[PDB]
Design goal:
Chain H: GO terms for molecular function: 3-methyl-2-oxobutanoate hydroxymethyltransferase activity; magnesium ion binding. The structure is cut from a larger assembly and holds eight copies of chain A. The first copy, chain A, has an eight-stranded parallel barrel with strand order 1-2-3-4-5-6-7-8, surrounded by seven helices. In chain A, β1, α2 and β2 form a beta-alpha-beta unit. The longest helix of chain A has 17 residues, at 145-161. Chain A has helices at residues 6-15, 27-35, 47-50, 62-74, 93-105, 120-128, 145-161, 173-182, 203-206, 228-240; strands spanning 19-23, 40-43, 80-84, 110-114, 133-138, 165-169, 187-190, 198-201. Chain A is an alpha/beta fold. The first copy, chain A, is built from ten helices and eight strands. In chain A, α2 packs across α4 (62-74), α5 crosses α6 (120-128) and α7 (145-161) runs parallel beside α8. Chain A has one domain (1-251): Phosphoenolpyruvate-binding domains (TIM Barrel), CATH 3.20.20. Chain A is globular and about 50 Å long. Chains E and G meet through α7 of E and α1 and α5 of G. The structure holds chloride ion (CL).
């Protein structure tokens, strides 16, 4: 299969093919996810929790993201490689650009950063300078009718500024549905219901690595499968046939 | 011959003498290309692919360009030395200037950087500060993840707008990359500065290729816009000679190298 | 359970309880392995292959090991945390000491480094300064270019004798643990018999005091034909936790490695 | 083919298969030389002349070698990758080791450094620590050359370059040693040969260097030129008498 | 208990539950204060005096605050962790942001910095970028050499209220009032929506703060008027801290004798 | 009172006045401890546990010790200021010397480092270059992972004699049976300072936070219990060391 | 006596008590000057000449001033400690602020920097961020190569007029103290009348709120016209400094022979 | 007058002309001391006390000495310029050499460092490499062994600090190089004091030469004259 490109994600939205995204932080899983036809691999600041064992993502540095990005990129996966700009690394457009350049030099093909309409200038600046941008709105880990209105304004503003992808995190299913309808770019949900152009989960969550209470947004795709590969395939398959997320995984 | 200067390239355009440009990244090829009367040598971020074995040009740093620039410069070629500002090094006019200064200290006589009309302020800033600028429009390889250009009527119109804008801001040379031949003819006719084509057809003031491509150092299918000038020549020198002469007599690029 | 210590490993040898060791490079797997009662977690330079996607372990830096060490240590596992000194970081006793100190500040409780008899002074120097040392003899993967690939070691009487000499030397110098890598089962058996410290085998057969595998190997992460000495414990198991428990159980009941995993 | 290893070179010497070595400093040539079955690629301090345009190799730094080493290694050639420790970077065994480590982290599989008998401790130190070593050397002069070669072999060098040595003196060194010898301006009685890439592609002005043949002249491609070199080394036709010391 | 959050402090104000804040600079005291149910722990530049033995807070660096912040954070207290941006580290909004990010990476959950209405741009900049801000008005100790009690005139009190409204409007979610007449602090508290935290500002604030070593009685001779030694006669250091928390919440501290 | 000096400690041993030592890491407590007439204040790598909240002392750096040293020293206490060389900072005599210099520039008057007979060359090197040295034998907490008798007692006495002969002017005995500590003290001429070593030492040390009850370890007493203030707790410690009532048998092996 | 503060200097002008200032660069002289009740100690870039032996003050760095400031501060004098921002360190307001912060961390309580009305924005920026500012007009020695040497300033009608405009602008921007250097006596008298903040003269005559000299000059270690050697004939260095302080306060120094 | 050199000090000893040494840390005092014909100016770690206000000399760094050395040197005094290697900067012969080089690049003409016969190797190493050395010592039997060892190793000057007078006299008689006393009595080849001490800006070893002179220059001249006529130090200034 060909490499997954940013324009390919748009074409998938138009065709109604749901986008399967997962976080990924190393070369062995990059290769495995690619065998399972994961569309987008995300070097996310979630590594602060799942790899570094910190209570929050705030300690994660730009150099941390660059290191795991280089690891994933060395596998040369066909999937689109997206990397987060961590909290504190995009406070001005020039800082955002320097941060993005570092990660793209390391192998990222698009960068993701959290925030609403205030980011519009930053998004425009990056896109103008050939950095593809994934926006991220809703519950943004680095941080009702009125809340839904502001979410929609945020999402429109970052789309208008040039973002070609957007993550919607912890949003009521009906609100996520409206945002998806109103935008032209693909939306990627986590805890946003099934009316999005695609889905994302943290790798370790969907392999059931945790102990005790599973987060509401997550399904353990490993339990009962014959291999880790089959678990990732089952996730991709369930995203694409519309069965994940189910009603029980909503906000 | 005398050193090739930026005014010399302009005079060549006025006189109908086509400009022969090639990428070059070391002192041995700098000397050989100069022996062959190449007019302009380009230390390009193409070295990310051809020298470093990377899949894209994104990893190439300013320090990388400065190193290869110094190598070429130490040969003291008569050709004009142009160096690329790599992606990420010209995001603001002050950053662009600092980047260009580093390369000019190392021996570049002109800097090249990719982008359309948005660059006008950056071009103006550099030119005002005595940095000669080569613009680069069409397919700009640093934009590979954001992305032949100008196939649409609107696409062609914007390319013309981009070329006019960077010329107006003070660019004294412009590369046209992967443009339909008829669109490139229009751009060339409408500008006053010399145009340098790669995959832009023959209606440009001159031509550029990647050195290694035109020496046939690639396996399998050659890129459409390249000719292997090495095949059938007695020497590497004669291959570069053959490229220079074919650019100048108008025989390269042929219709088969053009979109 | 209480924390696994270096003296606990010695007690386990004396009691015939096999030691279960696995590589580990992050906090999530540190926690999971500890739930499964893995005895020792190794921040190994194997991360160069399995995490970084390099063809050999040679590009792995001291800072790389320190980073993954800190991640594992943050989980505060009961398992003993061992970290490799990567290639080029222990060329003199002083350099080895500075390298070990950095990793122990990051949370390692013992350091491991590759080489035979010539390492005696270095081992002595570290042990004297309270750095616990795990030796590593046989196929030492940082010597890949000296060996001309990943070849089984000790296949001849002279190669077997040197391996014994190496093991004896590093033990006498004060190593409290030793890995035997890619050695014929009968050769590993004799080294285990002759030493007093616990031996930990990888591709060394079952007559060692314990066993180690690379985490990703035993989770079956890789496609195609795997090297003989590895076993995928994920197949047939309902969870990643269950796979790791199965590894621990098989090491301790003596069923892993089997003859099919041994040279 | 499988990867060329240090033990493979030794097996080739015993089989009488001559070893073809060439300098190489970038990924495009790394790939082309591999296609042509070059056995060993050398990131050599010759780059100071042929790439950097310096009059001597003295200005070449460790960082320079590491850069071009990384470029070659990124092509993942089957050929053995050898990199020079430049002058000034192996003055003590500890310094030599740190230098070799930097280059092996960057992708080198063996390091090469110039000098005679006095290097024995340095060679032993590196080899003990799993750094493979290529030595480089070249009536009383002949005796000392043979003493240098024996000393570095004894210390653990697994390959040795003989540069600018009378043919019959090189023949004696090759007979006396067990490890493979690699000649440049040392005649044909060596286990193999090395040239600077640019020299053998005819990229020089005017008169060829004495030890060098232009293998490009008359060939249809640069590939064919490197293929002709490899074939000529292996059938014993290069070097000829005109290429002697 | 659950972690104390910024929204929790707002809910406390609206419920009338007084907020107990105390300075803290290390892991043993972080744990002890948390056992005593201190609501907010402050890594304050007061450490320049009480830990470093300097005559003022001006020598305290951003790295000093980051170090003590990391020590407190490693204890993982439920209390909200607030850290000071020291004088000189927030002179422009970009600088203030860079400083705050360093402290939040080290474990701070909110940053505090001193100044009046001129800080409004700076506060807005940080809050928009997800840095929670505690303001600090009145006697701001980094301003010691500019000043040589703040709000003793009608003009002074008016400016204090303008300062407080400005930083609240800009997005500060907490504010310290230091060395303010009791009736003036009461007016500020009434006019603001966010919780006010007093030191030498009387009892009509949403909460109180003291320097740890002051309330543990660590210092000889006449102590400042607005401090009480909660340790004297206590069975343990823990009990002293518990007593402070209870006194704040039941309205026993500060007394009129601690107030101007 | 006059400043407490290394010779003063030796004179105290010979006079039978027990030496009261406590850890201290900041200026406020430096002043309070001085008001209570603590003889010696130790900027110890124990701060890794008590201040930094780490599970062991291994993460504590030379720069960490230097920072706390400067804090104590700025209070200008009369007590002798001793600072630890942390694990990893004294692996060669030259490294040990460089480390000690940095701490003495910051205000330390003597340095302490852990280990036995092997340290003799290091101690000599430092003492010859005018660095006063406190040795530390028995349970050396930097050896936590290495550690996880007639011969043990014999080696400890050998260790103590060796570091004294090399020039150490003070020695900490940690986690040693009371009768074995008694023998070491009798055999040495320099003052011994016990922690979990019983009462037959020339003096005693505890970690400040332990004796203030801010966490109970066997050899520790909470001196805050039953006292009216933090000052009174420190006073009570100094008095009980000096009248020989601490440590008690319940604090000893 | 209590510490001398910036507000205390303002009070002194209003009471008619002349302010005695002297340069000082080390702890021994800091203590001695304090014994003699010097009001203000200046760590001045004059150290480039008197300590470093340079021909001008241009080579003096911010780090140089910070070193000598720390030396003076360690003596803990009651006098106010003022430190110069050297030429090149206050070219933008943010640069001036960073420079001031470094010196205040080191123990300076007020900073001094040279220039006229163009500094207004810089002064405002510093004062707003709680940095106290002493202005310096007249002969500003860092401008030596602009002026073509150490020339008296204010000789022409236009020179004097600009000096007065400069003094007003910097006071209006928030300077709390101002040095007048090498100005005709009548011109300085007019500046002093027109300002409300204290003026401190050097070669500016007696009609200022106070005086400054370089320490080494007034100790007779060198005479320039506006200097008096207060050592010659006294029994000790202490007595010389005491005589200077007394003469400034009784209005007998500077005399007409020291004035332009 | 001509510049004072290391061999000049030796000539002065042979002639019985007492050597007047004073600490100095800046250009203004360097010039004044020179006017008063001070023979040797010492950039000493005493600056930790008298300039930096520290309780001890331990915080003084090599860079601190190099700074004040440059200041003194820029005055280009005729006096020999000697600079201290601080505690901690001469722990090995290689470290001592690197530290001395830094100071000599900054203008020192000789370096001084404290310690007994253990310094012999270090002294020899520096002297071999053209670094002039002033030793510094301060029990009696070992003191002589210390002084002899550093002289044999090549030191060309030595400071004797806090030494009983009759013991200093014996050390001076046994050595060939000049001895410089502070608290060591008058039977040395010369004397040193800290500048601020002898100007009365504050010790048993010290005389305030300022009180009752008409200028600072006159005070320094009085010091120089009293060292040279043998009236300083008096018995009241002894160990
Ligand atoms: Cl480079």
């Amino acid at each position: 299969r060909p490499a997954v490109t940013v324009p390919k994600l748009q074409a998938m939205r138009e065709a109604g093919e749901k986008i399967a995204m997962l976080t990924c932080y190393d070369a062995s899983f990059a290769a495995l996810l690619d065998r399972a036809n994961v569309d987008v691999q995300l070097i996310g600041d979630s590594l602060g929790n799942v790899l570094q064992g910190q209570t929050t993502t705030l300690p994660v540095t730009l150099d941390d993201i660059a290191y795991h990005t280089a690891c994933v990129a060395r596998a040369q996966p066909r999937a689109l490689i997206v990397a987060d700009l961590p909290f504190g690394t995009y406070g001005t457009p020039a800082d955002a650009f320097a941060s993005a350049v570092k990660l793209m030099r390391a192998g990222a093909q698009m960068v993701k950063f959290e925030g609403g309409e205030w980011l519009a200038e930053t998004v425009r600046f990056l896109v103008e300078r050939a950095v593809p941008v994934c926006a991220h709105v809703g519950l943004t880990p680095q941080s009702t009718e009125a809340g839904a209105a502001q979410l929609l304004r945020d999402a429109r503003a970052v789309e208008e500024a040039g973002a070609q992808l957007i993550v919607l995190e912890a949003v009521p299913t009906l609100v996520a549905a409206e945002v998806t309808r109103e935008l032209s770019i693909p939306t990627i949900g986590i805890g946003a219901g099934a009316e999005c152009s695609g889905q994302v989960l943290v790798l370790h969550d969907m392999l059931g690595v945790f102990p005790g209470k599973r987060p509401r947004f997550v399904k353990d795709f490993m339990q009962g499968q014959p291999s880790i590969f089959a678990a990732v395939e089952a996730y991709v398959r369930a995203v694409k046939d519309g069965s994940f997320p189910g009603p029980e995984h909503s906000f």
